[PDB]
């Protein structure tokens, strides 16, 4: 099958309406991939320990947050990961879906590898390189259907496939965490100089050691140029994702109080009846009156989260994740889990930009009703008295354990049986799409890194690597390795299907839509999604869930 | 049937998707109407002659454009007209359709009158008015199925039903043009004082006199409180309306010339090959070279129209209508038929605004490819020489017949076999929807006042009026009329159905959408479509055809 | 006390409500709205902000 | 066009199960609305005296 | 946030903003629901709605 | 008595109505107090604009 | 899933690294002026994102 293609390139997004507002979005994605031989032929147990006593080391006082120490199993295999919005839709698609649909769900996933080509490189004189075809050479493929091997979402480290169809990409090298004891003590710059920082890493433990190899756990297919490989279709079992945001906060839940009379002019206000004589209910029985702020609501929309909370286990210190909610007027970023990420040119960064530094963006939850304005928050002693003297009210300013900047809001946890909140927004195009659930008896109500969590087993990971291309001289009992310089290219097609539903339209007023404009320096300027004079592209994160929706 | 309702109020817009992108938009509209007795009991042949010698009269020199003289047949009947976008959709609907659909067409029309109530007014002392029910009184209804009577689109004079469901409306009084000779001579302020202006109006002519009465031409239904009336369903036969605009002008048609090399940097330009050596075709064979401007295109997109052309017939002088096209960069309003209209509070004007003056708006064609920039236009003598000396090129500045402001562009007609242009845009909410075609052997390719012209016979006009409520003393041989003061209220429900198709999405870049914003003083500020503190509404014209589309 | 209550339209819901013992798992009974029909007088102008109506009221079971 | 009924009836199906059917009827009074249209009303108690929000420590109000 | 003890010079920020595009929702009964007109001889029924809720214990712990 | 704030304004976070104990810590266990009119319970005889008020203490003792 | 109270800590935000003693609460610091009561003693980290294993069975007691 040498001179015949084994597949079809297709990167078009097709919409099929079944009627009644239901839509079958079928996203085809194809890319040309490049795979080079592994630097090492075997599996390595690598360790990373940044315990320098200067700069961003862990030995310098107060540098816990900079910790990067861990151990990993480095494998000669590579992973083909397309789990990221940017791989399947072009900007316009995302816009169209966000502006017209109100619901979206995963349906099925399929992939195939085809048109494999393997080449060898040899030298010449002047020295120039020459490229030849190794027709008989092959490429190894493996598919972990049952997810035996460690799950490693490439989207988390901007290592998925490129978001540009006409540009080539490459698979990310496979590696996974290995257990290793890790202890690091807490210190501050103010902390005494004589104080010694404990920075330790231990030996591999029997109770937690897990070394897996692709060779020993999965069946492997060999692909020569005339071969091709298919995964067959996988069926998703996940919950629908709302494509709208909520705005009603506790202050907007239920029957608004009855105004006494209609405003007298277009600029006037209206007044309610006296607090003392108004009907209603409160949960503070020390005061005989009702007020929008004291009034009993059905439940609590949103909640206070501990920030910037760091916890520690055998592995080391780590920042506890927080539910991405609205950052409010006050713009309390860390308190409401805003997410900031850095990515490469393959995933959005302007191709024109130069320097090692990646592009960075901070994602602020679309929803406006579940965030928390730490500044304006406060707790009043009871029996409650209004107004309260400084000794019967704890607020932002007040300091905990005599620390100027540590306020109660930093360690306050408001989560409770009455807490209700929306689901994290999907992030085009850098966002991860689906995720494997944690194998623990008691699971989390959601994940921060992805909108769709597989209730059952998630689609299996696709692994590839070049077959060792040996030379004429080879000795097994020698650690020395000689291999012919080889590399390969091949195409990848994937088919992701969604089930989506068109939105209803009942408000009298026009609704907020995701648009583009011509105003210079505007975030939504058309010029950002067009090519430059030399073809440089730029794909910034797009808004989503533009349309508002009743919460109650 | 006294104490039982005879109909249902319904003003909701329902979307039914049949699949494949086809949609059945069913717009229900209902209003409460008020009808008072006619000032006169009979038909009158009224004349209007503004021939004053001062102010806005026709006798003052140079005041032709101010002419209002004409004759009309005033009838005691009223017309219920709902032919206007604003009657059927609330703002959001229009937005949703414009942002998601690409095609729209009329399907069917139905209407009914119900819950009729008639009341009489009598006096009292202090004097106050008392209102009583006249159970036995009735209201007259007539439907002109075959359009025998003169067609009178109420949308043209902002006299259709109100665009607000929760607010009452009233039918417009029926009246129609009657033939009357009319002559008015042309003069200018500069024109000699002794010069006498001829302003004449003649006697009714035998060859063109047409006096119709509702009573003699249509069957009339009498409705007492317990009755109701239905039109049955009418089926439209019209062509589809594109919901996209075009941008390609003659300069963007076909194969762009081949650049020599790609730009060297993101700020650089690229160059084509020398005019003298470039391949291509032109229609000017005096010069041996091709250029984007000289290059032969398939046809002519858009064309030059005579403005502000006034023509005259027996009836009088009148401004010749022009095809609504883009007003260009130059913003030549009158040259590209921009439409300006003035409307009342019932049809958009801010309820808060005070003063007799109506609200005014100027509609500029959405399309950007068929307009004409009169300033930059010009004609070159042939054989053509480049560059041309002042004597071989006619441009804007040059004056016709020694008149400083009259340039060739004012009387230039570019229309020809190669002319191509888009259809006038629909205008929400003041725009007319459908229109009766002119009963002439050779018809116009379109109408300026409406997007849908009925190929066959248009829906018939609905007429109403109160039945003369006589008093105890009545004499036929007397011209004197005595009637009991009476008035009535009744509901009107209408059902208009459209067939529309969801738009495709293929561009890489996000597309322009109709949105709303929070920026103060912005034309699209949300605050414009919300009520005021005392309920004052405001409905401004909304954009349409936001999405661009290939022309070739 | 309130008897039943509509659940909050949020992906992650609360384990209960404080204001009511019964929360509808599905969609709650719909709200019933009423109002008097504008009872107009003999003189009426649409283009006017002024409103004149006959004093009216109603009773029903 | 209807029947007034405000009695509570208990129907025992046996095994301790009961079908409580509560009938409720009331005579209602409806007057015309003060305004004929929809209004976007605002309430702002930002007085600097009494139970206003401008006075120090009066958030709860 | 402020307290009575809080310094007098301290200024209390009390603000209310303009209607936002992202969260504005204006609904009208007329535009969203079908409306029935009832004259004296008419009447109106909702038909039966079926609840789907969990049982409520009538005992305390 | 926890107050939190969003774009809308400050508000008292609701709490699960439980027993108020021997100590009678009302606000700490979400006791509910409400004010109502004559149509809903208040003594018809009572006069003055002020409504009748009652504080509900959870029946449960555990 | 365990927790090493000693190595745990909370950093004030906006977060700065490294933090001066006033913008980081750690084990040592005392609550309400009590030498041995540290924040970790009354800190509740439970939340929607919490996941953990099931208690182990204990043979033979
Ligand atoms: Cl798969
Ligand atoms: Cl009809
Ligand atoms: Cl019901
Ligand atoms: Na922050
Ligand atoms: Na003009
Ligand atoms: Na208490």
UniProtKB/Swiss-Prot annotation, chain E:
Q: What does this protein do?
A: Capsid protein self-assembles to form an icosahedral capsid with a T=1 symmetry, about 22 nm in diameter, and consisting of 60 copies of two size variants of the capsid proteins, VP1 and VP2, which differ by the presence of an N-terminal extension in the minor protein VP1. The capsid encapsulates the genomic ssDNA. Capsid proteins are responsible for the attachment to host cell receptors. This attachment induces virion internalization predominantly through clathrin-dependent endocytosis.
| Organism the protein comes from | Hamster parvovirus H1
What does the sequence similarity comment in the record state about its family?
Belongs to the parvoviridae capsid protein family.
Localization terms from the record:
Virion; Host nucleus
Q: Under what name is this protein listed?
A: Capsid protein VP1
Give the top-rank taxon of the lineage listed in the UniProt record for this protein: Viruses
Q: What is the lineage of its organism?
A: Viruses, Monodnaviria, Shotokuvirae, Cossaviricota, Quintoviricetes
Q: What is known of its domains?
A: The N-terminus of VP1 is sequestered within the mature capsid. It contains a phospholipase A2-like region and putative nuclear localization signals.
């Amino acid at each position: 099958g040498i001179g015949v293609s084994t597949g079809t390139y297709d990167n078009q997004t097709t919409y099929k309406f079944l009627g009644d507002g239901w839509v079958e979005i079928t996203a085809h994605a194809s890319r040309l991939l490049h795979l080079g031989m592994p630097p090492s032929e075997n599996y390595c147990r690598v360790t990373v320990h940044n315990n320098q006593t200067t700069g961003h080391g862990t030995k310098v006082k107060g540098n816990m947050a900079y910790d990067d120490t861990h151990q990993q199993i480095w494998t000669p295999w590579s992973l083909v990961d397309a789990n990221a919005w940017g791989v399947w839709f072009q900007p316009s698609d995302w816009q169209f879906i966000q502006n017209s649909m109100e619901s979206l769900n995963l349906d099925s996933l399929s992939q195939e590898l085809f048109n494999v080509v393997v080449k060898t490189v040899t030298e010449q004189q002047g020295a120039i390189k020459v490229y030849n075809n190794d027709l008989t050479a092959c490429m190894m493929v493996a598919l972990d259907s049952n997810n035996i091997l460690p799950y490693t979402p490439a989207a988390q480290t901007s290592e998925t496939l490129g978001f540009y169809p006409w540009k080539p990409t490459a698979p990310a090298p496979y590696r996974y965490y290995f257990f290793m004891p890790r202890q690091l003590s807490v210190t501050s710059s103010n902390s005494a100089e004589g104080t010694q920082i404990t920075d330790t890493i231990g030996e591999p433990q029997a109770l937690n050691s897990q070394f897996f190899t692709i060779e020993n756990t999965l069946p492997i297919t060999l692909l020569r140029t005339g071969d091709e490989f298919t995964t067959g279709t996988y069926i998703f079992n996940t919950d629908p994702l709302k494509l709208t945001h909520t705005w009603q906060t506790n202050r907007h839940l239920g029957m608004p109080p009855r105004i006494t009379d209609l405003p007298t002019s277009d600029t006037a206000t209206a007044s309610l009846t006296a607090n003392g004589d108004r009907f209603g209910s409160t949960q503070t029985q020390n005061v005989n009156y009702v007020t929008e702020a004291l009034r009993t609501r059905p439940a609590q929309i949103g909640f206070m989260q501990p920030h910037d909370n760091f916890e520690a286990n055998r592995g080391g210190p780590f920042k506890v994740p927080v539910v991405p909610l609205d950052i409010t007027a006050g713009e309390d970023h860390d308190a409401n889990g805003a997410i900031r990420f850095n990515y490469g040119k393959q995933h959005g960064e302007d191709w024109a930009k130069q320097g090692a530094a990646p592009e960075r963006y901070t994602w602020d939850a679309i929803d406006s009703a579940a965030g928390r304005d730490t500044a304006r928050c406060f707790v009043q002693s009871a029996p409650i008295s209004i107004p309260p003297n400084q000794n019967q009210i704890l607020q932002r300013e007040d300091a905990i354990a005599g620390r100027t900047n540590m306020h109660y809001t930093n360690v306050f946890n408001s989560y409770g049986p009455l807490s209700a909140f929306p689901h994290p927004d999907p992030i085009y195009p850098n966002g991860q799409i689906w995720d494997k659930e944690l194998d623990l008896e008691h699971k989390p109500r959601l994940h921060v890194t992805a909108p769709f969590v597989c209730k059952n087993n998630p689609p299996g990971q696709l692994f590839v690597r070049l077959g060792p291309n040996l030379t004429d001289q080879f000795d097994p009992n020698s650690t020395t390795v000689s291999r012919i310089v080889t590399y390969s290219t091949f195409y990848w097609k994937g088919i992701l299907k969604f089930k989506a539903k068109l939105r209803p339209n009942l408000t009298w007023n026009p609704v907020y839509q995701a648009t583009t404009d011509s105003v210079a320096n505007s975030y939504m300027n058309v010029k950002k999604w067009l090519p430059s004079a030399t073809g440089n592209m730029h794909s910034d994160p797009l808004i989503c869930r533009p349309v508002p929706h009743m919460t109650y």
